[PDB]
Design a binder for these strands. Structure first.
Ligand SMILES: [Cl-]
Ligand code: NA
Length: 307
DNA sequence: ACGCGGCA
DNA sequence: GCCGCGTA
């Protein structure tokens, strides 16, 4: 339980503003401190203990000691007027901060403005068409139906395939922003070929409505369950050889903050961690537990990675 | 890391 | 062919 909601509320505001403004790493820094605040065992009540928490130095320790002494944050009044429109535009999938600054400085202010005068990549037109659906999280039971759809379409090509939905679904959340389905085969062999066929099969059945990125082993697209009343949902499908299954599981389960900290830890031990492998030369990792072992870390259930 | 898409 | 952008 967050004992410091008194301030994290105020700070996610600034964090989000820097984010849509394209100050990636300022926002990163703030996000990292917020997470420390959420998890610190008690409410913080002094400047000595501010800087105590890793992730808070001078500039951050202040705003905590300002909100505590003042009940407010001065910089929140000095937040650019454009920020809400920047957030609107970068909530379009395929449009980032640089694209949203452009459309802003071209004079656009509304989504109708974008549908009218703005030039859009294919992905951004899909993103804008599904704007509202894509900001809506799905119950995890809908995610299950999406996983099962992919799993059954795949298992008809080969029954031995492992298919696992990752993300916050795997971390136990009651709602999910999107679905990532990870596929492998234990025989180390049969994962080859079926990616093309499976996407067709799913396209042929009307399950896939829109393609966003067609990679060789990784697909990003849009799906919708059968029948009426349903929303388009972001779906990724990833096919991996069996020896990469553990690192793939760990990466696509996340969370993203958890992935960043693990990569950092791996770096401080002469290693690097990707969705593919734990490396120096690839260190074999048959299960997620082994990745944890090598980094000198206690295993952590998916629900415990929900950083 | 890597698809996407501009490059008049 | 290159390289910025966006997302993962
Ligand atoms: Cl989005
Ligand atoms: Na976006």
């Amino acid at each position: 339980t967050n004992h410091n909601l008194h301030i994290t509320e105020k700070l996610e505001v600034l964090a989000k503003a820097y984010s849509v403004q394209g100050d990636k790493w300022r926002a990163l820094g703030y996000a990292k401190a917020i997470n420390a605040l959420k998890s610190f065992h008690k409410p913080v009540t002094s400047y000595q203990e501010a800087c105590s928490i890793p992730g808070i130095g001078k500039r951050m320790a202040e705003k905590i000691i300002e909100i505590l002494e003042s009940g407010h944050l001065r910089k929140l009044d000095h937040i650019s007027e454009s920020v809400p429109v920047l957030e609107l535009f970068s909530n379009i999938w395929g449009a980032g901060t640089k694209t949203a600054q452009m459309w802003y400085q071209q004079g656009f202010r509304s989504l109708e403005d974008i549908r009218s005068q703005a030039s859009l990549t294919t992905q951004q037109a899909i993103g804008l068409k599904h704007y509202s659906d894509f900001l809506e999280r799905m119950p995890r039971e809908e995610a299950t139906e999406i996983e099962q759809t992919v799993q059954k379409a795949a298992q008809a090509f080969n029954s031995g395939l492992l298919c696992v939905a990752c993300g916050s679904y795997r971390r136990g959340k009651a709602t999910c922003g999107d679905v990532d389905v990870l596929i492998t085969h234990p025989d180390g062999r049969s994962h080859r070929g079926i990616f093309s066929r499976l996407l067709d099969s799913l396209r042929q059945e009307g399950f896939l409505t829109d393609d966003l990125v067609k990679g060789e082993t990784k697909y990003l697209g849009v799906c919708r369950l059968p029948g009426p009343g349903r929303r388009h949902r972001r779906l990724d499908i990833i096919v991996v050889p069996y020896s990469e299954f553990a690192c793939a599981l760990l990466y696509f389960t996340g969370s993203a903050h958890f992935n960043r900290s693990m990569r950092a830890l791996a770096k401080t031990k002469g290693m690097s961690l990707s969705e593919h492998a734990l490396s120096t030369r690839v260190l074999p990792t048959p299960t997620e537990k082994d990745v944890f072992r090598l980094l000198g870390l206690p295993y952590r259930e998916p629900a415990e990675r929900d950083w």
